[PDB]
């Protein structure tokens, strides 16, 4: 009677307003802000910086354009199926209708978050980056600077069944990088690819068949899979941890995430041989 992923992050031995001191910024596609699951919980900023869609005859249907971001906003704070039901979210559009963005657009978005914070500070901030490109010196630098300024960043490890160190922002050490595991606590396969792995991943979290808001209708739900969904679980857990202990530094928060994670439940045989000792065998969970 509960989505498998919400049961999985609950200690083995549902918080109704968790994470209320924290604001989660989401850099993703457009969102269906009037979907009942997230209405009133997500504030759509005026920020938009996206490349044009590929194909001269592309049809911009809101239900399709909003799919990715709406589901992730639901995973973080959704009324029925969210992790941190009291967290406020602010959304920035950096991915187009096909889920594609640019490093420059993402940089301008990260700058917009810091500028917004300086103008009207609130509580601790968590920035969710459910996206990946190739290793980028500039994107890693901007992420490092925003983390050093006191902001918590969480990103997807990437869905390329590859070493996360070859992608950004996954490869930025100051960012919490999250891989995906399934209901059997095994790394997620996505077609011929799957979750990334290696020394740049901090931990794993549920990322297969995750029930969340569907932009097909105002009350619809759909299951989705990917390291974006796993990163959204960690952004929700981080919002809950920071709301309970608002004075936590980034290093202390990372220590809490590791301490409360389920340990040694992943069969390391799924990863390439040399990556087994480098990949953390941790699946995120809430504290008791």
């Amino acid at each position: 009677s509960i989505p498998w992923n919400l049961e999985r992050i609950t200690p083995p031995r549902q918080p109704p307003d968790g994470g209320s001191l924290v604001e989660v910024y989401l850099l993703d596609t457009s969102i269906q802000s009037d979907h009942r699951e997230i209405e009133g919980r997500v504030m759509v900023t005026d920020f938009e910086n996206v490349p044009e869609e590929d194909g001269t005859r592309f049809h911009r249907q809101a239900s399709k354009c909003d799919s990715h971001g709406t589901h992730l906003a639901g995973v973080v704070s959704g009324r029925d199926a969210g992790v941190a039901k009291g967290a406020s979210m602010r959304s920035l559009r950096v991915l187009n209708c096909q889920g594609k963005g640019t490093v420059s657009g993402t940089l301008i978005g990260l700058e917009f978050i810091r500028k917004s914070q300086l103008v009207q500070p609130v509580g601790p901030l968590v920035v969710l980056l459910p996206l990946a490109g190739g290793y980028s010196r500039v994107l890693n630098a901007a992420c490092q600077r925003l983390a050093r300024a006191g902001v918590v960043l969480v990103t997807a490890a990437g869905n390329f069944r590859d070493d996360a160190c070859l992608y950004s922002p996954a490869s930025a050490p100051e960012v919490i990088t999250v891989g995906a595991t399934n209901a059997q606590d095994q790394p997620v396969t996505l077609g011929t690819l799957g979750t990334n792995f290696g020394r740049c991943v901090d931990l794993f979290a549920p990322g297969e068949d995750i029930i969340g808001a569907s932009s097909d209708c105002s009350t619809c739900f759909v299951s989705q899979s990917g390291t974006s969904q796993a990163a959204a679980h960690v952004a929700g857990i981080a919002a809950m941890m920071l709301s309970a202990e608002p004075e936590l530094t980034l290093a202390e928060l990372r220590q809490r995430l590791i301490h409360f994670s389920a340990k040694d439940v992943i069969n390391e045989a799924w990863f390439p041989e040399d990556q087994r000792v480098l990949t953390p065998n941790l699946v995120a969970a809430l504290p008791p």
């Binding site: 009677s1 509960i2 989505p3 498998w4 699951e37 029925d80 199926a81 209901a183 068949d209 029930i211 569907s214 097909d216 209708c217 009350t219 619809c220 739900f221 759909v222 299951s223």
Partner: peptide, 10 residues
């Protein structure tokens, strides 16, 4: 969980 529903499945 896998699927699609017109309301919250649980």
């Amino acid at each position: 969980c896998k699927x699609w529903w017109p309301t919250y499945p649980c």
